[PDB]
Design a protein around this ligand. Sequence first.
Ligand SMILES: O=C(O)CN(CCN(CC(=O)O)Cc1ccccc1O)Cc1ccccc1O
Ligand SMILES: [Cl-]
Ligand SMILES: [Cl-]
Ligand SMILES: [Cl-]
Ligand SMILES: [Fe+3]
Length: 499
Amino acid sequence: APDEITTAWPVNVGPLNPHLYTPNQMFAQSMVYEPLVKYQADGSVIPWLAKSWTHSEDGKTWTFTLRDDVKFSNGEPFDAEAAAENFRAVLDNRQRHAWLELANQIVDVKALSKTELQITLKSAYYPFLQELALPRPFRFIAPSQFKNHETMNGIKAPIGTGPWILQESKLNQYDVFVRNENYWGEKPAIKKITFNVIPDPTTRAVAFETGDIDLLYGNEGLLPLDTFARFSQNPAYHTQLSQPIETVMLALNTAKAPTNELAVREALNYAVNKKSLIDNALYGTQQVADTLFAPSVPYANLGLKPSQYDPQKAKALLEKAGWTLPAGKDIREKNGQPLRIELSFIGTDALSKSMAEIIQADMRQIGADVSLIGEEESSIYARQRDGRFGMIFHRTWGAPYDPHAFLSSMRVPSHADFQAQQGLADKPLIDKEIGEVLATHDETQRQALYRDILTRLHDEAVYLPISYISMMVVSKPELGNIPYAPIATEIPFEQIKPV
Ligand SMILES: O=C(O)CN(CCN(CC(=O)O)Cc1ccccc1O)Cc1ccccc1O
Ligand SMILES: [Cl-]
Ligand SMILES: [Cl-]
Ligand SMILES: [Cl-]
Ligand SMILES: [Fe+3]
């Protein structure tokens, strides 16, 4: 059976409501549900469920011409009415989509005919098409599967137009997908995909070694990185490591002592030998990051000055700010108060703990006492939401979220980035400029605004960028080369071709 594969995920795929978040898993929502326009690696979108579109003067009114040959997996038609109903269902839950500015921008969605769909916006929102292309929430479930003409209170069957259909799910055991034999587009070569629920990274590696799974595909947490490196030399196996997809960093709390001091945040940014951190904890598998966004990120090639590892400079910065060493102690003090910073992380995540131990050791060497606070996932999520941290691990979102959607979300108070930035004197100016950059028509102004926002965030040392991380693959050689999807959160199962 070379047209059936078995893979793994730490949890079940969830209900596969196209319009909700946890516990829905994005890769799976993307397997079943499809967008009007599809994101491509080059930053553009191509026609998808919409074959063409135009906008008014006045980029506020958009009219999409939809395909007329698409059916949902249950045989019901996809048309402008079905699409319009989906937009209504999403926007009936508007507050849950605040992070995504398109959700605050849509004023009206109307089916003008079976094939003409009209969307009107508040303002001329530039990233409109890219946001329609996201895994969620703007993808389409058969409206017959709404509950009481909504999706925010749940759905019936997870019926999409996509190339995969969920066959069955068993909580804490597995999820099975089958090829859609009535897909409007190209038939996948793979007919069946089974996801075994395997929460532990070493258990996932063991399941591969035993032959129990055929494919593992994910970020730096996919499997232990020492094991991945051994696998890459094993001629019985296939492995891949993509080019970097996003940044991993610390976020520093500018509203909490002692990270409220610019000098402290600058010093911390000179204290870490990132190459050593990566060679120590990540087995050399990732790239050093010195800016929030890699220079390859749209609008982010700004020539920002890196803070290279320089513990002499880190110490001098702290000294100048009045943090000095008592005899004969290693931890600096100012006004008799110790230079102590809490780093909270998920206590069961071994990679986080490994990185945190390295960070603690590096910062001790410059006289900062980092306290490691390892907690359960729920408590960490609460800390980020509410600003109850000194430092936390954080990551960017990858294409096409970076930079515009990541920046957009910095304005949302109940999230880590706003919370980390809350202490900055220029936070209001930053949030103003983020609003402006999303709305601006003037392309030179757009570049200037991105420059200013990213330059302030960099110069104010809000983050401590660590690494640009890659997607990783481990596979049975019989599966062949495994492609990557343009959207960092999607897995392109329909492009796998064992041939
Ligand atoms: O992540 C948040 O801060 C809030 N999420 C909005 C932005 N995410 C997009 C999304 O969830 O679709 C960004 C994102 C990008 C890439 C991978 C994962 C990911 O979540 C919504 C969100 C809400 C509840 C639980 C988990 C969630 O992700
Ligand atoms: Cl989740
Ligand atoms: Cl490797
Ligand atoms: Cl001072
Ligand atoms: Fe999210």
